[PDB]
Amino acid sequence: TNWESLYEKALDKVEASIRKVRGVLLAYNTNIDAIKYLKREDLEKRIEKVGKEEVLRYSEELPKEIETIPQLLGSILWSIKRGKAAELLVVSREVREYMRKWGWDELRMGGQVGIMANLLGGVYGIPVIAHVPQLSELQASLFLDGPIYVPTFERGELRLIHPREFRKGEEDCIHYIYEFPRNFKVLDFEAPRENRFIGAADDYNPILYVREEWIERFEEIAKRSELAIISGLHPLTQENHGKPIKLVREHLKILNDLGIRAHLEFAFTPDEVVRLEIVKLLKHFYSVGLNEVELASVVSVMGEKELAERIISKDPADPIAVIEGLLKLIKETGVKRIHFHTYGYYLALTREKGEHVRDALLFSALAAATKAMKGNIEKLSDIREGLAVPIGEQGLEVEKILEKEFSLRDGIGSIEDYQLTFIPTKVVKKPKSTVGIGDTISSSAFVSEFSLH
Ligand SMILES: Nc1ncnc2c1nc(Br)n2[C@@H]1O[C@H](COP(=O)(O)O)[C@@H](O)[C@H]1O
Ligand SMILES: Nc1ncnc2c1nc(Br)n2[C@@H]1O[C@H](COP(=O)(O)O)[C@@H](O)[C@H]1O
Ligand SMILES: OC[C@H]1O[C@H](O)[C@H](O)[C@@H](O)[C@@H]1O
Asked: How is this protein's activity kept under control?
């Protein structure tokens, strides 16, 4: 397969079409990300001062919400050991204070809503209508210029205004991002993949706080959009899910009634009652996006523990096991589209036939490579710089497996009445950071694919 030629042609095709989109609704979680680039000596001294044995215990136990500093350091170590992204609520004032003093190297726009708003609106030029729980001064300052809007109502009429006008009195919602590189060393551990641990320390996003005007006037807001991306459900628990999930179903009903194509961005959802609820919610979505650990966790709660294990047991996620999981998911939910992304390759399983599915995946992989290389995408010209990143060797090896097991040509084949679409990713050898690449991938492919028709 001439993947370099396909990548170049996909970039030009999507650039010609991407601005066609009338508008994209983004809800619900926006926050500020405070990013720390972990260093071995600093982490080792913090672990020693806190109690190494206790930290290690927490690095081998299932992460739960963080109440003590050993739990925090052990959850970071949990993520390093496995090269996996954990995200836990920091519910203790003492630990929030510890993290605040530990500090951050930079501040970035955070949350699925905010990251996709800055990309789709600030970079691609598509109008976005964004739900921001708390639009503090700092929160507002992290939005790019461009057609990014938050809804307001004046005498009953909808007015879209730019978010860099902050709302006086609303609070900063801080999430701490602890980034570590591939092969990061601490004690006798070494990270098998670049990744991060996220300590979520705000009081609005964990409960899926929704602003009153979105509760009252959702339909009027949603009419300004052609597509919707829904996120933020991952922190909910069996104890607090009732009110948020009830609202989300009401909004999804309106999106369905208006014919607005909706995409659910999955994040790892530890609470199994909420995780299964989200799987049931997918019966009202057109598209869903997820990675290898999320797919496994979903297949696991659908009664396929052995298959879930097969999905996460190999470093390049076992492509056959992944596809078996995607088939089970699309059959149970009836979604029209699943976009799977992992280290080395993406897969899509879709009702839609044709090359536009692959065009969108390749475009999104160019966006991912640029984001990995630069840390943040600032302008459309950045995406073309992703063409120089070489195609990873893992992706090419996975393609060989898929061509023996399926009838595939240039990444396209059939399973039952679905199209299977594969691409190998362009892998940056030393990325700056990883937070936000998933959002960049899922939003870029979902929106660009729609724009190609
Ligand atoms: N954020 C996260 N990412 C991946 N797996 C997670 C996770 N949080 C939890 Br809880 N897990 C769970 O951790 C298990 C994997 O643990 P090990 O990697 O120690 O085997 C998975 O079965 C998954 O359900
Ligand atoms: N160095 C790198 N170059 C290119 N893509 C990368 C990358 N590091 C990462 Br992480 N990515 C991509 O970013 C994706 C992030 O997905 P999650 O956040 O859902 O795990 C990965 O699946 C991988 O494809
Ligand atoms: O995609 C990255 C985002 O994931 C989650 O929403 C986190 O809570 C947030 O802090 C981060 O910016």
From this structure: Inhibited by 8-bromoadenosine phosphate (8-Br-AMP).
